[PDB]
Amino acid sequence: SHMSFSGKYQLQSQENFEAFMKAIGLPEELIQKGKDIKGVSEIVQNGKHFKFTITAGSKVIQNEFTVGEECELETMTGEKVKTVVQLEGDNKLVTTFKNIKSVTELNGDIITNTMTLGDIVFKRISKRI
């Protein structure tokens, strides 16, 4: 699949922000401050190479990787983890770090980011701007 993920996406809605952030051990102060922030996240894709600028609550996280190659991803807790991002199907980026299964799916202008920890499904829905 050679689908382009490039764009700026405005967060529309999210489910289980607080349950997820609590499950990852984010300090309560940051959870309360960040829970209602609906920012813009950016993806810059060049072939297999990706640069993500994610607005997640009160944190901005920058991650860069090439699909299929070992990368070091920065987590919400500030911890850096070694992992690999893969292309799944026609429109998905999939990775697994610190017992989280992450799925980034693009459907036209709608991006769905799903982070599954135990049976908590943290889902973010963003729209291209």
Ligand SMILES: Cc1sc(NC(=O)C2=C(C(=O)O)CCC2)c(-c2nc(C(F)(F)F)no2)c1C1CC1
């Ligand atoms: C708390 C979040 S949120 C999120 N990603 C998103 O929220 C996205 C969008 C949004 O703002 O809705 C649009 C595109 C991705 C990541 C993350 N995912 C990846 C990936 F590479 F796996 F996609 N790398 O970091 C993280 C963890 C700290 C890491």
